[PDB]
Amino acid sequence: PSVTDMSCEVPACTHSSDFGGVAIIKYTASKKGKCAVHSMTNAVTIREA
Amino acid sequence: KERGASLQHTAPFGCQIATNPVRAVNCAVGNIPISIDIPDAAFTRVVDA
């Protein structure tokens, strides 16, 4: 499922050692299925495959 | 016969007196520093807000 309408934002980031940023993103896909997510620079890290 | 100015009736800043024991209440001057320590249980993340 390809996606459109990429609207990401960050309500509260805190540069801690735990998951100190919960980024909220609204989108619009094409259909139903799995979707992988990935960070392309090494400044940040994600906990969800 | 000449007690005159009672401190109940002549108190500056509108304080009142009360006896046994002596105590002056409501001396409206100055300002109170007050601190509070509180854990994260009563708060909640913006992901619930």
JSON list of C-alpha atoms in Angstrom, two decimals:
[
{"chain": "A", "resi": 1, "resn": "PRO", "atom": "CA", "xyz": [0.00, 0.00, 0.00]},
{"chain": "A", "resi": 2, "resn": "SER", "atom": "CA", "xyz": [1.54, 3.25, -1.20]},
{"chain": "A", "resi": 3, "resn": "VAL", "atom": "CA", "xyz": [0.70, 6.35, 0.80]},
{"chain": "A", "resi": 4, "resn": "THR", "atom": "CA", "xyz": [0.04, 10.04, 0.22]},
{"chain": "A", "resi": 5, "resn": "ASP", "atom": "CA", "xyz": [-0.75, 13.15, 2.31]},
{"chain": "A", "resi": 6, "resn": "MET", "atom": "CA", "xyz": [2.33, 12.89, 4.53]},
{"chain": "A", "resi": 7, "resn": "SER", "atom": "CA", "xyz": [1.66, 15.10, 7.55]},
{"chain": "A", "resi": 8, "resn": "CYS", "atom": "CA", "xyz": [4.16, 14.47, 10.34]},
{"chain": "A", "resi": 9, "resn": "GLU", "atom": "CA", "xyz": [4.68, 16.57, 13.43]},
{"chain": "A", "resi": 10, "resn": "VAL", "atom": "CA", "xyz": [6.19, 16.22, 16.89]},
{"chain": "A", "resi": 11, "resn": "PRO", "atom": "CA", "xyz": [4.09, 17.25, 19.90]},
{"chain": "A", "resi": 12, "resn": "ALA", "atom": "CA", "xyz": [6.83, 16.79, 22.48]},
{"chain": "A", "resi": 13, "resn": "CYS", "atom": "CA", "xyz": [10.41, 15.72, 21.91]},
{"chain": "A", "resi": 14, "resn": "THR", "atom": "CA", "xyz": [12.87, 15.35, 24.77]},
{"chain": "A", "resi": 15, "resn": "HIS", "atom": "CA", "xyz": [16.41, 14.28, 23.89]},
{"chain": "A", "resi": 16, "resn": "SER", "atom": "CA", "xyz": [16.71, 11.65, 26.62]},
{"chain": "A", "resi": 17, "resn": "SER", "atom": "CA", "xyz": [17.93, 8.06, 26.59]},
{"chain": "A", "resi": 18, "resn": "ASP", "atom": "CA", "xyz": [14.42, 6.55, 26.67]},
{"chain": "A", "resi": 19, "resn": "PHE", "atom": "CA", "xyz": [11.85, 7.15, 23.91]},
{"chain": "A", "resi": 20, "resn": "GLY", "atom": "CA", "xyz": [11.74, 10.86, 24.55]},
{"chain": "A", "resi": 21, "resn": "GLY", "atom": "CA", "xyz": [9.97, 11.77, 21.34]},
{"chain": "A", "resi": 22, "resn": "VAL", "atom": "CA", "xyz": [6.52, 10.62, 20.28]},
{"chain": "A", "resi": 23, "resn": "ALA", "atom": "CA", "xyz": [6.06, 11.75, 16.70]},
{"chain": "A", "resi": 24, "resn": "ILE", "atom": "CA", "xyz": [2.48, 11.86, 15.45]},
{"chain": "A", "resi": 25, "resn": "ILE", "atom": "CA", "xyz": [1.83, 11.52, 11.73]},
{"chain": "A", "resi": 26, "resn": "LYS", "atom": "CA", "xyz": [-1.42, 11.58, 9.76]},
{"chain": "A", "resi": 27, "resn": "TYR", "atom": "CA", "xyz": [-1.35, 10.08, 6.28]},
{"chain": "A", "resi": 28, "resn": "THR", "atom": "CA", "xyz": [-3.57, 8.74, 3.49]},
{"chain": "A", "resi": 29, "resn": "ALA", "atom": "CA", "xyz": [-2.80, 5.31, 2.07]},
{"chain": "A", "resi": 30, "resn": "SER", "atom": "CA", "xyz": [-4.01, 3.27, -0.89]},
{"chain": "A", "resi": 31, "resn": "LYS", "atom": "CA", "xyz": [-5.04, -0.03, 0.76]},
{"chain": "A", "resi": 32, "resn": "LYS", "atom": "CA", "xyz": [-4.65, -2.22, 3.85]},
{"chain": "A", "resi": 33, "resn": "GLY", "atom": "CA", "xyz": [-1.43, -3.98, 4.81]},
{"chain": "A", "resi": 34, "resn": "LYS", "atom": "CA", "xyz": [1.89, -3.83, 6.60]},
{"chain": "A", "resi": 35, "resn": "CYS", "atom": "CA", "xyz": [4.23, -0.89, 6.11]},
{"chain": "A", "resi": 36, "resn": "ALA", "atom": "CA", "xyz": [7.87, -0.57, 7.13]},
{"chain": "A", "resi": 37, "resn": "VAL", "atom": "CA", "xyz": [9.23, 2.64, 8.61]},
{"chain": "A", "resi": 38, "resn": "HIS", "atom": "CA", "xyz": [12.84, 3.76, 8.58]},
{"chain": "A", "resi": 39, "resn": "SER", "atom": "CA", "xyz": [15.10, 6.60, 9.73]},
{"chain": "A", "resi": 40, "resn": "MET", "atom": "CA", "xyz": [17.49, 7.75, 7.01]},
{"chain": "A", "resi": 41, "resn": "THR", "atom": "CA", "xyz": [19.89, 9.87, 9.09]},
{"chain": "A", "resi": 42, "resn": "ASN", "atom": "CA", "xyz": [21.76, 8.74, 12.18]},
{"chain": "A", "resi": 43, "resn": "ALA", "atom": "CA", "xyz": [20.65, 11.57, 14.47]},
{"chain": "A", "resi": 44, "resn": "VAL", "atom": "CA", "xyz": [17.46, 9.78, 15.52]},
{"chain": "A", "resi": 45, "resn": "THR", "atom": "CA", "xyz": [16.39, 6.20, 16.20]},
{"chain": "A", "resi": 46, "resn": "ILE", "atom": "CA", "xyz": [13.02, 4.45, 16.10]},
{"chain": "A", "resi": 47, "resn": "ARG", "atom": "CA", "xyz": [11.58, 1.56, 18.13]},
{"chain": "A", "resi": 48, "resn": "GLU", "atom": "CA", "xyz": [8.99, 0.27, 15.66]},
{"chain": "A", "resi": 49, "resn": "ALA", "atom": "CA", "xyz": [9.75, -2.08, 12.77]},
{"chain": "B", "resi": 1, "resn": "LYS", "atom": "CA", "xyz": [-12.39, 51.25, 83.46]},
{"chain": "B", "resi": 2, "resn": "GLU", "atom": "CA", "xyz": [-9.85, 52.58, 80.95]},
{"chain": "B", "resi": 3, "resn": "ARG", "atom": "CA", "xyz": [-8.49, 49.59, 79.01]},
{"chain": "B", "resi": 4, "resn": "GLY", "atom": "CA", "xyz": [-9.31, 51.52, 75.83]},
{"chain": "B", "resi": 5, "resn": "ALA", "atom": "CA", "xyz": [-7.48, 50.33, 72.75]},
{"chain": "B", "resi": 6, "resn": "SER", "atom": "CA", "xyz": [-7.84, 46.58, 72.55]},
{"chain": "B", "resi": 7, "resn": "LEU", "atom": "CA", "xyz": [-5.47, 44.87, 70.14]},
{"chain": "B", "resi": 8, "resn": "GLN", "atom": "CA", "xyz": [-8.43, 42.96, 68.76]},
{"chain": "B", "resi": 9, "resn": "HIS", "atom": "CA", "xyz": [-9.83, 46.34, 67.74]},
{"chain": "B", "resi": 10, "resn": "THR", "atom": "CA", "xyz": [-6.60, 48.22, 66.96]},
{"chain": "B", "resi": 11, "resn": "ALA", "atom": "CA", "xyz": [-4.58, 45.71, 64.96]},
{"chain": "B", "resi": 12, "resn": "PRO", "atom": "CA", "xyz": [-2.85, 47.04, 61.83]},
{"chain": "B", "resi": 13, "resn": "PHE", "atom": "CA", "xyz": [-3.47, 45.20, 58.55]},
{"chain": "B", "resi": 14, "resn": "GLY", "atom": "CA", "xyz": [-6.73, 43.73, 59.87]},
{"chain": "B", "resi": 15, "resn": "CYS", "atom": "CA", "xyz": [-5.34, 40.90, 61.94]},
{"chain": "B", "resi": 16, "resn": "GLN", "atom": "CA", "xyz": [-7.56, 39.27, 64.53]},
{"chain": "B", "resi": 17, "resn": "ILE", "atom": "CA", "xyz": [-6.56, 37.98, 67.94]},
{"chain": "B", "resi": 18, "resn": "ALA", "atom": "CA", "xyz": [-7.60, 34.82, 69.75]},
{"chain": "B", "resi": 19, "resn": "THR", "atom": "CA", "xyz": [-6.57, 33.83, 73.23]},
{"chain": "B", "resi": 20, "resn": "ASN", "atom": "CA", "xyz": [-5.63, 30.59, 75.03]},
{"chain": "B", "resi": 21, "resn": "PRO", "atom": "CA", "xyz": [-3.09, 30.41, 73.40]},
{"chain": "B", "resi": 22, "resn": "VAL", "atom": "CA", "xyz": [-2.44, 33.86, 71.95]},
{"chain": "B", "resi": 23, "resn": "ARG", "atom": "CA", "xyz": [-2.64, 33.85, 68.16]},
{"chain": "B", "resi": 24, "resn": "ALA", "atom": "CA", "xyz": [-2.93, 36.53, 65.51]},
{"chain": "B", "resi": 25, "resn": "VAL", "atom": "CA", "xyz": [-4.68, 35.47, 62.32]},
{"chain": "B", "resi": 26, "resn": "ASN", "atom": "CA", "xyz": [-4.88, 37.01, 58.84]},
{"chain": "B", "resi": 27, "resn": "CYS", "atom": "CA", "xyz": [-1.92, 39.40, 58.86]},
{"chain": "B", "resi": 28, "resn": "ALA", "atom": "CA", "xyz": [-2.15, 40.39, 55.21]},
{"chain": "B", "resi": 29, "resn": "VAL", "atom": "CA", "xyz": [1.39, 41.45, 54.42]},
{"chain": "B", "resi": 30, "resn": "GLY", "atom": "CA", "xyz": [4.32, 39.74, 52.78]},
{"chain": "B", "resi": 31, "resn": "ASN", "atom": "CA", "xyz": [4.13, 36.80, 50.44]},
{"chain": "B", "resi": 32, "resn": "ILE", "atom": "CA", "xyz": [4.60, 33.08, 50.96]},
{"chain": "B", "resi": 33, "resn": "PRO", "atom": "CA", "xyz": [7.02, 30.96, 48.95]},
{"chain": "B", "resi": 34, "resn": "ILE", "atom": "CA", "xyz": [5.51, 27.53, 48.47]},
{"chain": "B", "resi": 35, "resn": "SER", "atom": "CA", "xyz": [7.13, 24.54, 46.79]},
{"chain": "B", "resi": 36, "resn": "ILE", "atom": "CA", "xyz": [5.67, 21.23, 45.72]},
{"chain": "B", "resi": 37, "resn": "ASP", "atom": "CA", "xyz": [7.29, 17.97, 44.71]},
{"chain": "B", "resi": 38, "resn": "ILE", "atom": "CA", "xyz": [5.13, 15.61, 42.68]},
{"chain": "B", "resi": 39, "resn": "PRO", "atom": "CA", "xyz": [5.80, 12.44, 40.62]},
{"chain": "B", "resi": 40, "resn": "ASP", "atom": "CA", "xyz": [4.88, 11.63, 37.04]},
{"chain": "B", "resi": 41, "resn": "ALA", "atom": "CA", "xyz": [1.89, 9.45, 37.98]},
{"chain": "B", "resi": 42, "resn": "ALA", "atom": "CA", "xyz": [-0.57, 12.35, 38.20]},
{"chain": "B", "resi": 43, "resn": "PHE", "atom": "CA", "xyz": [0.58, 13.87, 34.92]},
{"chain": "B", "resi": 44, "resn": "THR", "atom": "CA", "xyz": [-0.07, 12.28, 31.56]},
{"chain": "B", "resi": 45, "resn": "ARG", "atom": "CA", "xyz": [1.67, 12.44, 28.19]},
{"chain": "B", "resi": 46, "resn": "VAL", "atom": "CA", "xyz": [0.37, 14.55, 25.30]},
{"chain": "B", "resi": 47, "resn": "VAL", "atom": "CA", "xyz": [-0.37, 11.19, 23.60]},
{"chain": "B", "resi": 48, "resn": "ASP", "atom": "CA", "xyz": [-3.31, 11.06, 26.01]},
{"chain": "B", "resi": 49, "resn": "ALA", "atom": "CA", "xyz": [-4.02, 14.78, 25.79]}
]
